[PDB]
Symmetry: none
Subunit: 284 residues, 2 copies
Protein backbone atom coordinates (compact mmCIF):
# COMPACT_ATOMS: atom_id res chain seq x y z
CA UNK A 1 0.00 0.00 0.00
CA UNK A 2 2.81 2.48 0.75
CA UNK A 3 3.84 2.25 -2.92
CA UNK A 4 0.24 2.42 -4.23
CA UNK A 5 -1.56 5.59 -5.32
CA UNK A 6 -5.10 5.46 -6.74
CA UNK A 7 -4.67 1.70 -7.08
CA UNK A 8 -1.46 1.98 -9.17
CA UNK A 9 1.67 0.34 -7.75
CA UNK A 10 4.42 2.91 -8.18
CA UNK A 11 7.09 0.50 -6.92
CA UNK A 12 8.88 2.96 -4.65
CA UNK A 13 7.34 4.29 -1.43
CA UNK A 14 9.36 7.54 -1.29
CA UNK A 15 8.35 8.24 -4.90
CA UNK A 16 4.77 7.17 -4.14
CA UNK A 17 4.61 9.71 -1.29
CA UNK A 18 5.68 12.59 -3.53
CA UNK A 19 3.12 11.54 -6.16
CA UNK A 20 0.39 10.93 -3.55
CA UNK A 21 1.06 14.45 -2.22
CA UNK A 22 0.62 15.85 -5.73
CA UNK A 23 -2.74 14.06 -5.95
CA UNK A 24 -3.69 15.33 -2.46
CA UNK A 25 -2.82 18.88 -3.59
CA UNK A 26 -5.32 18.42 -6.45
CA UNK A 27 -8.16 17.35 -4.15
CA UNK A 28 -7.30 20.16 -1.73
CA UNK A 29 -7.56 22.72 -4.54
CA UNK A 30 -10.88 21.21 -5.67
CA UNK A 31 -12.21 21.34 -2.10
CA UNK A 32 -11.08 24.97 -1.76
CA UNK A 33 -12.46 26.09 -5.13
CA UNK A 34 -15.84 24.38 -4.69
CA UNK A 35 -16.63 25.15 -1.03
CA UNK A 36 -18.75 28.29 -0.68
CA UNK A 37 -21.05 29.73 2.00
CA UNK A 38 -23.94 27.36 1.22
CA UNK A 39 -22.31 20.26 0.06
CA UNK A 40 -21.31 16.63 -0.16
CA UNK A 41 -20.79 17.84 -3.72
CA UNK A 42 -17.55 16.06 -4.71
CA UNK A 43 -18.72 12.87 -2.98
CA UNK A 44 -16.22 7.76 -9.69
CA UNK A 45 -14.81 10.67 -7.74
CA UNK A 46 -11.41 9.08 -7.93
CA UNK A 47 -7.75 9.94 -8.08
CA UNK A 48 -7.06 8.16 -11.39
CA UNK A 49 -7.16 11.29 -13.53
CA UNK A 50 -5.29 13.35 -10.90
CA UNK A 51 -2.70 10.55 -10.79
CA UNK A 52 -2.51 10.59 -14.60
CA UNK A 53 -2.01 14.36 -14.69
CA UNK A 54 0.72 14.30 -12.03
CA UNK A 55 2.51 11.37 -13.69
CA UNK A 56 2.34 13.07 -17.09
CA UNK A 57 3.99 16.15 -15.59
CA UNK A 58 6.76 13.83 -14.43
CA UNK A 59 7.70 13.37 -18.10
CA UNK A 60 8.74 16.96 -18.83
CA UNK A 61 11.97 18.39 -17.39
CA UNK A 62 10.44 21.30 -15.41
CA UNK A 63 7.11 20.48 -13.75
CA UNK A 64 5.19 23.55 -12.60
CA UNK A 65 3.64 21.99 -9.52
CA UNK A 66 1.12 24.82 -9.00
CA UNK A 67 -0.05 24.65 -12.63
CA UNK A 68 -0.06 20.84 -12.54
CA UNK A 69 -2.34 21.02 -9.49
CA UNK A 70 -4.68 23.35 -11.38
CA UNK A 71 -4.78 21.07 -14.45
CA UNK A 72 -5.59 18.00 -12.36
CA UNK A 73 -8.33 19.83 -10.48
CA UNK A 74 -9.76 21.03 -13.83
CA UNK A 75 -9.70 17.55 -15.37
CA UNK A 76 -11.23 15.78 -12.39
CA UNK A 77 -13.97 18.35 -11.81
CA UNK A 78 -14.96 17.85 -15.45
CA UNK A 79 -14.94 14.07 -14.87
CA UNK A 80 -17.25 14.39 -11.87
CA UNK A 81 -19.63 16.65 -13.77
CA UNK A 82 -19.97 14.14 -16.62
CA UNK A 83 -20.88 11.59 -13.94
CA UNK A 84 -23.59 13.85 -12.52
CA UNK A 85 -25.07 14.47 -15.98
CA UNK A 86 -24.80 10.80 -16.96
CA UNK A 87 -26.82 9.71 -13.91
CA UNK A 88 -29.85 11.76 -14.93
CA UNK A 89 -29.71 10.61 -18.56
CA UNK A 90 -28.90 7.04 -17.41
CA UNK A 91 -32.45 14.69 -7.30
CA UNK A 92 -32.37 15.08 -11.10
CA UNK A 93 -32.53 18.89 -11.24
CA UNK A 94 -30.05 19.22 -8.36
CA UNK A 95 -27.67 16.67 -9.88
CA UNK A 96 -27.67 18.69 -13.12
CA UNK A 97 -27.00 21.94 -11.26
CA UNK A 98 -24.15 20.28 -9.34
CA UNK A 99 -22.60 19.16 -12.61
CA UNK A 100 -23.06 22.63 -14.04
CA UNK A 101 -21.28 24.15 -11.01
CA UNK A 102 -18.41 21.67 -11.42
CA UNK A 103 -18.16 22.69 -15.08
CA UNK A 104 -18.23 26.40 -14.25
CA UNK A 105 -15.54 26.00 -11.59
CA UNK A 106 -13.35 23.94 -13.94
CA UNK A 107 -13.61 26.64 -16.60
CA UNK A 108 -12.73 29.33 -14.05
CA UNK A 109 -9.64 27.36 -12.93
CA UNK A 110 -8.24 26.61 -16.39
CA UNK A 111 -8.29 30.32 -17.26
CA UNK A 112 -5.35 30.61 -14.85
CA UNK A 113 -3.38 28.30 -17.15
CA UNK A 114 -3.55 30.70 -20.09
CA UNK A 115 -4.92 30.77 -23.64
CA UNK A 116 -3.61 27.41 -24.86
CA UNK A 117 -5.03 25.49 -21.88
CA UNK A 118 -8.35 27.28 -22.31
CA UNK A 119 -8.67 26.12 -25.93
CA UNK A 120 -7.73 22.56 -24.95
CA UNK A 121 -10.55 22.42 -22.42
CA UNK A 122 -13.10 24.00 -24.78
CA UNK A 123 -12.21 21.42 -27.43
CA UNK A 124 -12.55 18.68 -24.82
CA UNK A 125 -16.03 19.93 -23.91
CA UNK A 126 -16.92 19.70 -27.61
CA UNK A 127 -15.82 16.06 -27.70
CA UNK A 128 -17.73 15.31 -24.49
CA UNK A 129 -20.99 16.65 -25.89
CA UNK A 130 -20.30 14.96 -29.24
CA UNK A 131 -20.09 11.55 -27.56
CA UNK A 132 -23.23 12.10 -25.50
CA UNK A 133 -24.86 13.23 -28.73
CA UNK A 134 -23.58 10.07 -30.44
CA UNK A 135 -24.48 7.80 -27.52
CA UNK A 136 -28.13 8.84 -27.69
CA UNK A 137 -23.61 2.39 -38.63
CA UNK A 138 -21.40 -0.35 -37.18
CA UNK A 139 -22.65 -0.49 -33.61
CA UNK A 140 -19.25 -1.42 -32.15
CA UNK A 141 -17.40 1.24 -34.12
CA UNK A 142 -19.93 3.65 -32.58
CA UNK A 143 -19.53 2.33 -29.04
CA UNK A 144 -15.76 2.75 -29.27
CA UNK A 145 -16.35 6.21 -30.76
CA UNK A 146 -18.50 7.12 -27.75
CA UNK A 147 -16.00 6.15 -25.08
CA UNK A 148 -13.16 7.79 -27.01
CA UNK A 149 -15.20 11.02 -27.08
CA UNK A 150 -16.66 10.95 -23.58
CA UNK A 151 -13.81 9.25 -21.73
CA UNK A 152 -10.59 9.11 -23.76
CA UNK A 153 -10.64 12.78 -24.73
CA UNK A 154 -10.60 13.99 -21.11
CA UNK A 155 -7.68 11.79 -20.07
CA UNK A 156 -5.92 12.89 -23.25
CA UNK A 157 -6.28 16.51 -22.14
CA UNK A 158 -4.84 15.56 -18.74
CA UNK A 159 -1.85 14.04 -20.52
CA UNK A 160 -1.56 17.12 -22.75
CA UNK A 161 -1.71 19.55 -19.84
CA UNK A 162 0.73 17.40 -17.85
CA UNK A 163 3.27 17.56 -20.67
CA UNK A 164 2.72 21.25 -21.40
CA UNK A 165 3.16 22.34 -17.79
CA UNK A 166 6.34 20.34 -17.27
CA UNK A 167 7.89 21.88 -20.38
CA UNK A 168 7.86 18.63 -22.35
CA UNK A 169 8.63 18.97 -26.04
CA UNK A 170 5.80 19.43 -28.52
CA UNK A 171 6.15 15.84 -29.67
CA UNK A 172 6.06 14.43 -26.11
CA UNK A 173 2.92 16.49 -25.37
CA UNK A 174 1.21 15.01 -28.43
CA UNK A 175 2.31 11.55 -27.29
CA UNK A 176 0.99 12.04 -23.76
CA UNK A 177 -2.30 13.26 -25.22
CA UNK A 178 -2.51 10.14 -27.41
CA UNK A 179 -1.60 7.88 -24.48
CA UNK A 180 -4.32 9.42 -22.30
CA UNK A 181 -6.91 8.92 -25.03
CA UNK A 182 -5.99 5.27 -25.41
CA UNK A 183 -5.80 4.80 -21.63
CA UNK A 184 -9.33 6.16 -21.16
CA UNK A 185 -10.78 3.76 -23.72
CA UNK A 186 -8.91 0.70 -22.43
CA UNK A 187 -10.00 1.59 -18.88
CA UNK A 188 -13.66 1.55 -19.95
CA UNK A 189 -13.30 -1.70 -21.91
CA UNK A 190 -11.70 -3.37 -18.89
CA UNK A 191 -14.66 -2.09 -16.83
CA UNK A 192 -17.11 -3.60 -19.33
CA UNK A 193 -15.27 -6.93 -19.11
CA UNK A 194 -14.77 -6.91 -15.32
CA UNK A 195 -18.47 -6.30 -14.66
CA UNK A 196 -19.31 -9.66 -16.28
CA UNK A 197 -16.24 -11.67 -15.14
CA UNK A 198 -17.05 -10.81 -11.48
CA UNK A 199 -17.52 -6.15 -7.09
CA UNK A 200 -21.16 -6.81 -7.93
CA UNK A 201 -21.67 -8.49 -11.28
CA UNK A 202 -24.01 -7.28 -14.03
CA UNK A 203 -24.60 -4.15 -12.00
CA UNK A 204 -25.14 -3.07 -15.59
CA UNK A 205 -28.89 -3.38 -16.20
CA UNK A 206 -29.74 -1.57 -19.44
CA UNK A 207 -26.20 -0.77 -20.59
CA UNK A 208 -24.99 -2.43 -23.81
CA UNK A 209 -21.26 -2.80 -23.13
CA UNK A 210 -18.56 -4.10 -25.47
CA UNK A 211 -18.73 -7.85 -24.61
CA UNK A 212 -22.53 -7.70 -24.97
CA UNK A 213 -22.27 -5.89 -28.31
CA UNK A 214 -20.06 -8.69 -29.61
CA UNK A 215 -22.25 -11.53 -28.27
CA UNK A 216 -25.42 -10.14 -29.87
CA UNK A 217 -23.77 -10.50 -33.31
CA UNK A 218 -23.36 -14.30 -33.12
CA UNK A 219 -25.93 -16.91 -34.17
CA UNK A 220 -28.82 -18.71 -28.61
CA UNK A 221 -30.84 -15.64 -27.68
CA UNK A 222 -30.57 -12.90 -25.07
CA UNK A 223 -33.00 -12.13 -22.29
CA UNK A 224 -31.95 -8.51 -22.48
CA UNK A 225 -33.24 -4.96 -21.88
CA UNK A 226 -35.55 -9.94 -12.94
CA UNK A 227 -32.87 -11.66 -10.84
CA UNK A 228 -32.70 -15.08 -12.48
CA UNK A 229 -33.04 -13.18 -15.77
CA UNK A 230 -29.88 -11.33 -14.72
CA UNK A 231 -27.89 -14.44 -13.80
CA UNK A 232 -29.23 -16.20 -16.91
CA UNK A 233 -27.83 -13.30 -18.93
CA UNK A 234 -24.50 -13.55 -17.09
CA UNK A 235 -23.81 -17.18 -18.03
CA UNK A 236 -24.36 -16.44 -21.72
CA UNK A 237 -21.84 -13.58 -21.79
CA UNK A 238 -19.06 -15.35 -19.87
CA UNK A 239 -19.46 -18.23 -22.33
CA UNK A 240 -19.92 -16.27 -25.61
CA UNK A 241 -17.02 -15.66 -28.01
CA UNK A 242 -18.05 -12.03 -27.58
CA UNK A 243 -16.14 -12.00 -24.30
CA UNK A 244 -12.91 -13.17 -25.97
CA UNK A 245 -13.54 -10.62 -28.74
CA UNK A 246 -13.89 -7.79 -26.21
CA UNK A 247 -10.58 -8.80 -24.62
CA UNK A 248 -8.93 -8.63 -28.03
CA UNK A 249 -10.06 -5.01 -28.45
CA UNK A 250 -8.73 -4.29 -24.95
CA UNK A 251 -5.44 -5.85 -26.01
CA UNK A 252 -5.33 -3.60 -29.09
CA UNK A 253 -5.55 -0.50 -26.91
CA UNK A 254 -3.02 -1.95 -24.45
CA UNK A 255 -0.69 -2.53 -27.42
CA UNK A 256 -1.14 1.06 -28.59
CA UNK A 257 -0.60 2.50 -25.10
CA UNK A 258 2.60 0.49 -24.75
CA UNK A 259 3.76 1.63 -28.19
CA UNK A 260 3.37 5.23 -27.01
CA UNK A 261 5.03 4.47 -23.66
CA UNK A 262 8.13 3.13 -25.43
CA UNK A 263 8.87 6.45 -27.15
CA UNK A 264 8.53 8.43 -23.94
CA UNK A 265 11.81 9.62 -22.38
CA UNK A 266 13.59 7.16 -20.08
CA UNK A 267 12.61 8.96 -16.90
CA UNK A 268 10.88 7.70 -13.73
CA UNK A 269 7.53 9.09 -14.95
CA UNK A 270 7.60 6.67 -17.88
CA UNK A 271 7.80 3.64 -15.55
CA UNK A 272 5.05 5.17 -13.41
CA UNK A 273 2.85 5.53 -16.50
CA UNK A 274 3.55 1.95 -17.58
CA UNK A 275 2.36 0.75 -14.18
CA UNK A 276 -0.68 2.96 -14.70
CA UNK A 277 -1.26 1.20 -18.03
CA UNK A 278 -0.80 -2.22 -16.39
CA UNK A 279 -3.39 -1.38 -13.76
CA UNK A 280 -5.68 0.09 -16.42
CA UNK A 281 -5.86 -3.16 -18.41
CA UNK A 282 -6.01 -5.23 -15.19
CA UNK A 283 -8.93 -6.09 -12.84
CA UNK A 284 -8.85 -2.53 -11.38
CA UNK B 1 -39.46 54.38 -35.03
CA UNK B 2 -36.62 55.03 -32.59
CA UNK B 3 -37.62 51.90 -30.64
CA UNK B 4 -35.61 48.68 -30.51
CA UNK B 5 -37.30 46.34 -28.05
CA UNK B 6 -40.16 48.31 -26.59
CA UNK B 7 -37.49 50.83 -25.57
CA UNK B 8 -37.29 54.30 -27.10
CA UNK B 9 -33.54 54.95 -27.35
CA UNK B 10 -33.48 58.43 -28.87
CA UNK B 11 -31.97 59.30 -32.23
CA UNK B 12 -32.89 57.04 -35.14
CA UNK B 13 -29.24 56.67 -36.15
CA UNK B 14 -28.35 55.34 -32.70
CA UNK B 15 -31.35 52.99 -32.71
CA UNK B 16 -30.37 51.72 -36.15
CA UNK B 17 -26.84 50.99 -35.00
CA UNK B 18 -28.23 49.16 -31.96
CA UNK B 19 -30.78 47.11 -33.95
CA UNK B 20 -27.95 46.06 -36.25
CA UNK B 21 -25.73 45.10 -33.31
CA UNK B 22 -28.43 42.91 -31.77
CA UNK B 23 -29.25 41.30 -35.12
CA UNK B 24 -25.53 40.51 -35.47
CA UNK B 25 -25.66 38.63 -32.14
CA UNK B 26 -28.63 36.53 -33.25
CA UNK B 27 -26.86 35.78 -36.55
CA UNK B 28 -23.61 34.73 -34.86
CA UNK B 29 -25.63 32.51 -32.51
CA UNK B 30 -27.43 30.85 -35.43
CA UNK B 31 -24.19 30.31 -37.33
CA UNK B 32 -22.16 29.00 -34.39
CA UNK B 33 -24.95 26.70 -33.12
CA UNK B 34 -25.49 24.79 -36.38
CA UNK B 35 -24.17 21.22 -36.25
CA UNK B 36 -32.23 19.09 -34.38
CA UNK B 37 -31.03 18.95 -30.78
CA UNK B 38 -32.43 22.43 -30.09
CA UNK B 39 -34.89 24.80 -31.76
CA UNK B 40 -34.10 28.47 -31.20
CA UNK B 41 -37.03 30.86 -31.33
CA UNK B 42 -36.49 33.99 -33.42
CA UNK B 43 -37.26 36.90 -31.09
CA UNK B 44 -36.42 39.44 -33.79
CA UNK B 45 -33.98 41.44 -31.73
CA UNK B 46 -35.96 41.53 -28.46
CA UNK B 47 -33.75 39.30 -26.25
CA UNK B 48 -32.89 41.35 -23.13
CA UNK B 49 -29.29 40.22 -22.72
CA UNK B 50 -27.90 40.88 -26.26
CA UNK B 51 -29.58 44.29 -26.08
CA UNK B 52 -27.91 45.09 -22.75
CA UNK B 53 -24.54 43.96 -24.11
CA UNK B 54 -24.92 46.06 -27.28
CA UNK B 55 -26.14 49.07 -25.30
CA UNK B 56 -23.22 48.72 -22.87
CA UNK B 57 -20.80 48.57 -25.80
CA UNK B 58 -22.13 51.95 -27.00
CA UNK B 59 -20.15 53.44 -24.11
CA UNK B 60 -16.89 52.32 -25.73
CA UNK B 61 -15.19 53.81 -28.79
CA UNK B 62 -15.63 50.50 -30.72
CA UNK B 63 -19.25 49.42 -30.06
CA UNK B 64 -19.28 47.26 -33.20
CA UNK B 65 -16.05 45.39 -32.48
CA UNK B 66 -16.47 41.73 -33.43
CA UNK B 67 -15.66 40.68 -29.86
CA UNK B 68 -18.78 42.56 -28.67
CA UNK B 69 -20.98 40.33 -30.84
CA UNK B 70 -19.21 37.21 -29.55
CA UNK B 71 -19.78 38.41 -25.98
CA UNK B 72 -23.47 38.98 -26.64
CA UNK B 73 -23.88 35.55 -28.24
CA UNK B 74 -21.95 33.93 -25.38
CA UNK B 75 -24.14 35.65 -22.78
CA UNK B 76 -27.33 34.60 -24.52
CA UNK B 77 -26.21 30.97 -24.99
CA UNK B 78 -25.51 30.77 -21.26
CA UNK B 79 -29.00 32.10 -20.58
CA UNK B 80 -30.51 29.63 -23.05
CA UNK B 81 -28.64 26.72 -21.49
CA UNK B 82 -30.15 27.55 -18.09
CA UNK B 83 -33.62 27.47 -19.69
CA UNK B 84 -32.93 23.97 -21.00
CA UNK B 85 -31.44 22.73 -17.71
CA UNK B 86 -34.38 24.34 -15.87
CA UNK B 87 -36.64 21.82 -17.64
CA UNK B 88 -35.00 18.78 -16.02
CA UNK B 89 -37.77 17.02 -14.08
CA UNK B 90 -37.29 15.37 -10.69
CA UNK B 91 -38.55 18.68 -24.17
CA UNK B 92 -38.85 15.17 -25.46
CA UNK B 93 -37.27 14.33 -22.10
CA UNK B 94 -34.65 14.94 -19.45
CA UNK B 95 -31.95 13.65 -21.79
CA UNK B 96 -32.73 16.15 -24.56
CA UNK B 97 -32.92 19.08 -22.13
CA UNK B 98 -29.59 18.19 -20.51
CA UNK B 99 -27.92 17.64 -23.87
CA UNK B 100 -29.36 20.81 -25.41
CA UNK B 101 -28.09 22.81 -22.43
CA UNK B 102 -24.68 21.12 -22.58
CA UNK B 103 -24.48 21.90 -26.30
CA UNK B 104 -25.12 25.60 -25.72
CA UNK B 105 -22.54 25.51 -22.90
CA UNK B 106 -19.92 23.79 -25.09
CA UNK B 107 -20.56 26.26 -27.92
CA UNK B 108 -20.31 29.15 -25.46
CA UNK B 109 -16.98 27.66 -24.26
CA UNK B 110 -15.53 27.69 -27.76
CA UNK B 111 -16.61 31.29 -28.37
CA UNK B 112 -15.49 32.74 -25.04
CA UNK B 113 -12.19 30.82 -25.22
CA UNK B 114 -11.20 32.95 -28.19
CA UNK B 115 -12.10 36.10 -26.27
CA UNK B 116 -9.29 35.21 -23.85
CA UNK B 117 -8.64 33.83 -20.35
CA UNK B 118 -9.99 36.90 -18.53
CA UNK B 119 -13.28 36.68 -20.43
CA UNK B 120 -13.30 32.93 -19.70
CA UNK B 121 -12.94 33.68 -15.99
CA UNK B 122 -15.77 36.24 -16.02
CA UNK B 123 -18.25 33.97 -17.83
CA UNK B 124 -17.27 30.89 -15.82
CA UNK B 125 -17.58 32.76 -12.53
CA UNK B 126 -20.90 34.21 -13.72
CA UNK B 127 -22.26 30.76 -14.62
CA UNK B 128 -21.04 29.47 -11.24
CA UNK B 129 -22.88 32.41 -9.63
CA UNK B 130 -25.94 31.68 -11.75
CA UNK B 131 -25.90 28.03 -10.66
CA UNK B 132 -25.46 28.67 -6.92
CA UNK B 133 -28.31 31.15 -7.27
CA UNK B 134 -30.50 28.25 -8.41
CA UNK B 135 -29.11 25.98 -5.68
CA UNK B 136 -29.70 28.71 -3.08
CA UNK B 137 -33.27 29.21 -4.33
CA UNK B 138 -33.90 25.56 -3.48
CA UNK B 139 -31.47 34.98 8.31
CA UNK B 140 -32.91 38.07 6.61
CA UNK B 141 -35.49 36.76 4.12
CA UNK B 142 -35.23 39.87 1.92
CA UNK B 143 -31.45 39.98 1.75
CA UNK B 144 -31.69 36.22 1.13
CA UNK B 145 -34.10 36.60 -1.79
CA UNK B 146 -32.04 39.48 -3.16
CA UNK B 147 -28.86 37.42 -2.95
CA UNK B 148 -30.66 34.69 -4.90
CA UNK B 149 -31.89 36.92 -7.72
CA UNK B 150 -28.56 38.75 -7.84
CA UNK B 151 -26.86 35.37 -8.31
CA UNK B 152 -29.41 33.69 -10.58
CA UNK B 153 -30.33 36.70 -12.77
CA UNK B 154 -28.31 39.83 -11.98
CA UNK B 155 -24.82 38.37 -12.47
CA UNK B 156 -25.35 37.38 -16.09
CA UNK B 157 -26.58 40.87 -16.95
CA UNK B 158 -23.68 42.33 -14.99
CA UNK B 159 -21.42 40.17 -17.17
CA UNK B 160 -23.10 41.51 -20.31
CA UNK B 161 -22.32 45.03 -19.15
CA UNK B 162 -18.76 44.05 -18.23
CA UNK B 163 -18.10 42.27 -21.53
CA UNK B 164 -19.83 44.95 -23.59
CA UNK B 165 -17.62 47.58 -21.99
CA UNK B 166 -14.39 45.56 -22.23
CA UNK B 167 -14.58 44.67 -25.90
CA UNK B 168 -16.00 47.97 -27.14
CA UNK B 169 -12.85 49.50 -25.62
CA UNK B 170 -14.48 51.37 -22.72
CA UNK B 171 -12.29 52.58 -19.85
CA UNK B 172 -11.60 50.39 -16.82
CA UNK B 173 -13.80 52.50 -14.56
CA UNK B 174 -16.53 52.40 -17.19
CA UNK B 175 -16.33 48.60 -17.40
CA UNK B 176 -16.80 48.44 -13.61
CA UNK B 177 -19.71 50.88 -13.65
CA UNK B 178 -21.46 48.95 -16.45
CA UNK B 179 -20.98 45.69 -14.52
CA UNK B 180 -22.59 47.25 -11.40
CA UNK B 181 -25.39 48.72 -13.53
CA UNK B 182 -26.07 45.31 -15.05
CA UNK B 183 -26.38 43.58 -11.70
CA UNK B 184 -28.81 46.17 -10.41
CA UNK B 185 -30.83 46.21 -13.65
CA UNK B 186 -31.03 42.41 -13.69
CA UNK B 187 -32.27 42.39 -10.09
CA UNK B 188 -34.90 45.00 -10.91
CA UNK B 189 -35.70 42.93 -14.01
CA UNK B 190 -36.41 39.91 -11.79
CA UNK B 191 -38.25 41.87 -9.09
CA UNK B 192 -40.42 43.25 -11.89
CA UNK B 193 -41.09 39.73 -13.21
CA UNK B 194 -41.96 38.57 -9.69
CA UNK B 195 -44.43 41.41 -9.20
CA UNK B 196 -45.93 40.90 -12.67
CA UNK B 197 -46.42 37.20 -11.86
CA UNK B 198 -48.98 38.35 -9.24
CA UNK B 199 -50.51 41.43 -10.98
CA UNK B 200 -52.61 41.58 -14.16
CA UNK B 201 -49.98 34.37 -14.02
CA UNK B 202 -49.56 32.48 -10.74
CA UNK B 203 -46.54 30.42 -11.88
CA UNK B 204 -44.59 31.30 -8.72
CA UNK B 205 -47.41 30.31 -6.36
CA UNK B 206 -47.85 26.97 -8.17
CA UNK B 207 -44.09 26.43 -8.17
CA UNK B 208 -43.87 27.23 -4.45
CA UNK B 209 -41.19 29.89 -4.99
CA UNK B 210 -41.26 32.77 -2.49
CA UNK B 211 -40.79 36.12 -4.21
CA UNK B 212 -40.43 39.65 -2.85
CA UNK B 213 -44.19 40.47 -2.54
CA UNK B 214 -44.87 37.21 -0.67
CA UNK B 215 -41.83 37.54 1.60
CA UNK B 216 -42.89 40.98 2.82
CA UNK B 217 -46.46 39.72 3.31
CA UNK B 218 -45.31 36.84 5.56
CA UNK B 219 -43.83 39.51 7.86
CA UNK B 220 -47.23 40.78 9.03
CA UNK B 221 -49.85 38.94 11.12
CA UNK B 222 -53.64 38.62 11.22
CA UNK B 223 -48.66 31.28 5.13
CA UNK B 224 -50.56 28.73 3.02
CA UNK B 225 -47.64 29.01 0.57
CA UNK B 226 -45.68 26.37 2.50
CA UNK B 227 -45.11 24.16 -0.51
CA UNK B 228 -46.40 24.33 -4.09
CA UNK B 229 -50.05 24.67 -5.13
CA UNK B 230 -51.76 22.35 -7.62
CA UNK B 231 -55.45 23.31 -7.64
CA UNK B 232 -56.39 26.26 -9.85
CA UNK B 233 -58.89 27.43 -7.23
CA UNK B 234 -56.26 28.03 -4.54
CA UNK B 235 -54.06 29.74 -7.16
CA UNK B 236 -56.72 32.37 -7.89
CA UNK B 237 -57.13 32.77 -4.12
CA UNK B 238 -53.48 33.51 -3.27
CA UNK B 239 -53.18 36.01 -6.12
CA UNK B 240 -56.09 38.16 -4.88
CA UNK B 241 -54.87 37.82 -1.28
CA UNK B 242 -51.28 38.78 -2.16
CA UNK B 243 -52.66 41.56 -4.37
CA UNK B 244 -54.12 43.07 -1.17
CA UNK B 245 -51.23 42.68 1.27
CA UNK B 246 -49.09 45.78 1.94
CA UNK B 247 -46.17 43.48 1.11
CA UNK B 248 -47.19 44.02 -2.50
CA UNK B 249 -46.73 47.79 -2.12
CA UNK B 250 -43.43 47.17 -0.33
CA UNK B 251 -42.06 45.07 -3.20
CA UNK B 252 -42.96 47.91 -5.60
CA UNK B 253 -41.08 50.32 -3.35
CA UNK B 254 -38.01 48.08 -3.39
CA UNK B 255 -38.31 47.83 -7.18
CA UNK B 256 -38.39 51.62 -7.41
CA UNK B 257 -35.34 51.70 -5.13
CA UNK B 258 -33.43 49.39 -7.48
CA UNK B 259 -34.35 51.69 -10.37
CA UNK B 260 -32.94 54.64 -8.39
CA UNK B 261 -29.83 52.52 -7.74
CA UNK B 262 -29.45 51.93 -11.49
CA UNK B 263 -29.93 55.64 -12.24
CA UNK B 264 -27.20 56.48 -9.76
CA UNK B 265 -24.92 54.04 -11.55
CA UNK B 266 -25.63 55.26 -15.05
CA UNK B 267 -25.59 58.98 -14.17
CA UNK B 268 -21.78 58.90 -14.00
CA UNK B 269 -21.33 57.36 -17.46
CA UNK B 270 -20.19 59.77 -20.21
CA UNK B 271 -22.88 62.09 -21.57
CA UNK B 272 -23.38 60.19 -24.83
CA UNK B 273 -26.41 58.61 -26.57
CA UNK B 274 -25.64 55.24 -24.97
CA UNK B 275 -26.20 56.63 -21.48
CA UNK B 276 -29.67 57.84 -22.47
CA UNK B 277 -30.52 54.49 -24.07
CA UNK B 278 -29.47 52.73 -20.85
CA UNK B 279 -31.54 55.21 -18.83
CA UNK B 280 -34.49 54.40 -21.09
CA UNK B 281 -33.92 50.65 -20.73
CA UNK B 282 -33.98 51.10 -16.94
CA UNK B 283 -37.24 53.04 -17.07
CA UNK B 284 -38.83 50.44 -19.33
CA UNK B 285 -37.68 47.50 -17.17
CA UNK B 286 -39.33 48.86 -14.01
CA UNK B 287 -42.50 49.96 -15.86
Amino acid sequence: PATVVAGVDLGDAVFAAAVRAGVARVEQLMDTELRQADMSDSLGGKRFRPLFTVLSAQIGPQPDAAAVTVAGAVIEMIHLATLYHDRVMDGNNVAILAGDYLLATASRLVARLGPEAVRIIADTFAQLVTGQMRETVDSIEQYLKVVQEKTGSLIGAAGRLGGMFSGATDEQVERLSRLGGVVGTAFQIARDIIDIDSPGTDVREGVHTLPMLYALRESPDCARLDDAEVREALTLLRASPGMARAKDVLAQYAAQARHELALLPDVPGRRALAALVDYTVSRH
